[PDB]
Amino acid sequence: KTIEVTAEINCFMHLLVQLFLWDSKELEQLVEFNRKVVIPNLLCYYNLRSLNLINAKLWFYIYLSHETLARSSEEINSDNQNIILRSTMMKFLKIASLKHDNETKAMLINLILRDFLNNGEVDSASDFISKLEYPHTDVSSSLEARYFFYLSKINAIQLDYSTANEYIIAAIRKAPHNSKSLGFLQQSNKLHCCIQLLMGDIPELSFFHQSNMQKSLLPYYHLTKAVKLGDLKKFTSTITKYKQLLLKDDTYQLCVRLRSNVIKTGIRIISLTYKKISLRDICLKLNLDSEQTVEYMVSRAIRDGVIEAKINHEDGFIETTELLNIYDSEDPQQVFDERIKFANQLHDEYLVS
Amino acid sequence: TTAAPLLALLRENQDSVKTYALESINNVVDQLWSEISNELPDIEALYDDDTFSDREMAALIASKVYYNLGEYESAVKYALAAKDRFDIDEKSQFVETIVSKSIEMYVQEASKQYTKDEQFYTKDIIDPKLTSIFERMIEKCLKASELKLALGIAL
Amino acid sequence: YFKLKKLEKEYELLTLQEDYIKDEQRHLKRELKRAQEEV
């Protein structure tokens, strides 16, 4: 009548464990079996005065059947049922309001945003910024790895580098689990190791073996001989033989930045970092491309801010500006803004707990 | 085609141009309104069009787009001009949320303009359609003539 | 409905009891050394 309904709330996720892994047969009917919980005796019964009684793992088992492409594949290959599911995933967003969903609302957009990898508009995420501002109630256990893991691929569009350093840590925090050690931990270091070749360096080649298989990161170690050293010849031989390893998820599209660093970092291995350079000395290492197009190599990196240089049209005199006057006014201030907010960051937590 | 030329389709007779697509939208507007971020200047343009007679529905859309945005004033004031475009018997969150906002926003012009004139809702000082929405959800529970439910409103 | 008039009881307690002590913390610290040095 009253108490008997409350005691059956925790009975949802109990018996649904044995319906995962081993027996995958028709898991979309389980969604219809989940609908027996969803519509009746939940939305039409409760007054929506409760918060902690709704978890993100309720509907999380739906999309897990879409990437199988073997047994379930929705109810049909046409994938016409996901139209209702698209409104079903967002059905709880309308339930989230000013006075409703002070906690679960945080975990709603996430799985919806985690669904935007290969399907769904990713430009609405810029429009989701208006509704993205909420106070964070708590972080418990497995959230840390579930925020930016799939979102580490956002930087594969906007063409940005330094941002990937801050958000790649979310993939390696509490990454290994019982069933996630093989499945979700491999993709963590695959996106982590490539970012280590974009700006910084790899601390150790064998340090990543304890988490991800070294053979999976093996081609990235050969790219260190090419991308990190800025060599185009050894880069083409690496992509050709390892192209089979590039057939994984979003492992091909990261090669766009791998071949761009060959030009960017290639300037660094060349003496262009030094002040006085001539074009006839430049054509030696860049001979693999051409002569007259070298002026496009240096000039492109000047507007982006990698290195500044002056090019002569006759003999190709290269004068690169070396700034010894930096870190004087307003240059360190960008770092000073972070050092100021670190004091009260951990100090205000003492008043809370 | 930007938001401005969309009014040219209203220079002829169709009221369903944006309404015919609202079959699966008009109810869920509290969800998909993120795509209207580019159509924001078109929202107020549909209400000021005389050839467009669904502006009361467009006024209701203006309430549902600014609802989840966090603005309670726009989620109400734009719904006064709609008269009845929507059934209040659903008793959803859209029905109950306005009840709390319609009472709170009514006090804003209550304790101030009442000192000068007794009736502040008759003239143009405040939208007179606030009485119309006051006759919808508020008088729905007043059918039994119970003052206990209207107690805090008159205070 | 009628409870809304009584929801301002505990809401106004924590607001009046907050700034009352916050200002006193600076007075008790200054008045500390007055009696501390007095003995």
């Binding site: - | 109950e96 | 409870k3 929801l7 916050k22 006193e24 610290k29």
Partner: peptide
């Protein structure tokens, strides 16, 4: 109504801070 729920949700948030203001006052 939101005015009923929003008022109650602001209690437990400021409760812990006021408790330690009295503890620091009693410590002095």
């Amino acid at each position: 109504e939101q005015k009923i729920q929003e008022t109650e949700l602001k209690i437990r948030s400021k409760t812990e801070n006021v408790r330690r203001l009295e503890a620091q006052r009693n410590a002095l």
